């Protein structure tokens, strides 16, 4: 019906925090996936930029 | 709830709930069956009475 595309840049270690229902700094105080999230997490490196 | 972060603790509490919630139906079903015996014995009394 209606999608929300939201993006940001995080570290290569903390991206495993980027799982809904997990802990760690990015999911604790920065950006929070919900308790029931069906969204897809797309992640890649942009080290050359 | 104290030890574990909720996202995993959800699955744990299931095994409690599923266990306990089942354990009620066991108890309830027993009472139904057992009451149906008393219900039969009650009529025997009401018949004698």
Swiss-Prot record, chain A:
This is Spike protein S1. Attaches the virion to the cell membrane by interacting with host receptor, initiating the infection. The major receptor is host ACE2. When S2/S2' has been cleaved, binding to the receptor triggers direct fusion at the cell membrane. When S2/S2' has not been cleaved, binding to the receptor results in internalization of the virus by endocytosis using host TFRC and GRM2 and leading to fusion of the virion membrane with the host endosomal membrane. Alternatively, may use NRP1/NRP2 and integrin as entry receptors. Binds to host ACE2. RBD also interacts with the N-linked glycan on 'Asn-90' of ACE2. Cleavage of S generates a polybasic C-terminal sequence on S1 that binds to host Neuropilin-1 (NRP1) and Neuropilin-2 (NRP2) receptors. Interacts with host integrin alpha-5/beta-1 (ITGA5:ITGB1) and with ACE2 in complex with integrin alpha-5/beta-1 (ITGA5:ITGB1). May interact via cytoplasmic c-terminus with M protein. May interact (via N-terminus) with host bilirubin and biliverdin, thereby preventing antibody binding to the SARS-CoV-2 spike NTD via an allosteric mechanism. Changing residue 16 to S: In strain: Omicron/BA.2, Omicron/BA.2.12.1, Omicron/BA.2.75, Omicron/BA.4, Omicron/BA.5, Omicron/BQ.1.1, Omicron/XBB.1.5, Omicron/EG.5.1. It comes from the Viruses. Changing residue 25 to T: In strain: Gamma/P.1. It comes from Severe acute respiratory syndrome coronavirus 2 (2019-nCoV). The lineage of its organism: Viruses, Riboviria, Orthornavirae, Pisuviricota, Pisoniviricetes. Residues 11-13 are annotated as: Integrin-binding motif.
From Swiss-Prot, chain B:
Changing residue 47 to I: In strain: Gamma/P.1. Changing residue 2 to A: In strain: Alpha/B.1.1.7. Changing residue 1 to F: In strain: Omicron/BA.1. Subunit of the fusion protein that is processed upon entry into the host cell. Mediates fusion of the virion and cellular membranes by functioning as a class I viral fusion protein. Contains a viral fusion peptide that is unmasked after S2 cleavage. This cleavage can occur at the cell membrane by host TMPRSS2 or during endocytosis by host CSTL. In either case, this triggers an extensive and irreversible conformational change that leads to fusion of the viral envelope with the cellular cytoplasmic membrane, releasing viral genomic RNA into the host cell cytoplasm. This is Spike protein S2'.
């Amino acid at each position: 019906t209606n999608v929300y595309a939201d993006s940001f840049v995080i570290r290569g270690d903390e991206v495993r925090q980027i799982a809904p229902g997990q802990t760690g700094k990015i999911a604790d105080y920065n950006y929070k996936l919900p308790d029931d999230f069906t969204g897809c997490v797309i992640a890649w490196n942009s080290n050359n930029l | 709830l104290s030890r574990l972060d909720k996202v995993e603790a959800e699955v744990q509490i299931d095994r409690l709930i599923t266990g306990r919630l089942q354990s009620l139906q066991t108890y309830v079903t027993q009472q139904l069956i057992r009451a149906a015996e008393i219900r039969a014995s009650a009529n025997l009394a009401a018949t004698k009475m």
